[PDB]
Write a protein that binds this ligand. Sequence first.
Ligand SMILES: NCc1ccc(C(F)(F)F)cc1
Length: 330
Amino acid sequence: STGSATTTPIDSLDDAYITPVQIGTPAQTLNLDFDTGSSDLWVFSSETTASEVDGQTIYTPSKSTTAKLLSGATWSISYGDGSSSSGDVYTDTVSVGGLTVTGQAVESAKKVSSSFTEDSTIDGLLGLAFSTLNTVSPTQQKTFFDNAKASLDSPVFTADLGYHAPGTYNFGFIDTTAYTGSITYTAVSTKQGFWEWTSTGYAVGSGTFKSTSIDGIADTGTTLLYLPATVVSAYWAQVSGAKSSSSVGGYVFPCSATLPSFTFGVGSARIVIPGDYIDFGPISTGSSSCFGGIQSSAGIGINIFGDVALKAAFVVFNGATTPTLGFASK
Ligand SMILES: NCc1ccc(C(F)(F)F)cc1
């Protein structure tokens, strides 16, 4: 079987993407943020503290004839930006784009941090990293992808994110009309639970390609591109007037400048990020300083190929017994 669903930017900067997901019987449709950097499926629900909910669609397990409380199970998660949430656990039917899993763990938020509450367009997260990162206790739970793997035609999903435009998540098949050229595959380490891979180098604008190993994760759940300080300094040095700002928390640049592209290596292939993708607009309304889409990973501890990078490519997440990541130009 296969599934296919459209994913839509939540705002005009592509800060995140939401995908409709059907939970329960009869279906309750929630717009979830598909996150290959985490492994929990959690939703705003009828059990979330009423003050922590501001326009989200909530899952109501009591209206689902297929929902079952997973007695005694709890979950608690903290994200790399300081976000957190926690609650209890149901199992229920979950469908994405026509692909249905029965008995999926649905983590119901009783508490959410403030940054989820302020984001009225996101009803929850759908984790697509490896199930070893799932936070359910005492019994760890499988991700939607892991549950679906058996019945998929091919154990893969693909991410085709749009620039200021809708895109597609496909499960179980590779759409050979959605990319150009060949797909280059590259090895994945699952030892930390992430889709972790090694990029072979980079170039700034039309400069020479520097061969150098950059280990990092493919994370649809992270907006920006976080790379080592040496790389990020070499990029912003080519933008007149760019500087690292401690009050803003990263590199900013004059909104009037034009940004060079950024190339990253996948084996012998090259993925080019157009400079326009790196502009995240004014730091405050009316400001002439603009926020850069490439930032240093030094304070994070791991390099992250977030949406800025991934939306420049067609990306294959191959969850075969030896996993790989595939990249193609589009
Ligand atoms: N998208 C989920 C996520 C968030 C943060 C991190 C970090 F910061 F731990 F690398 C990984 C994955």
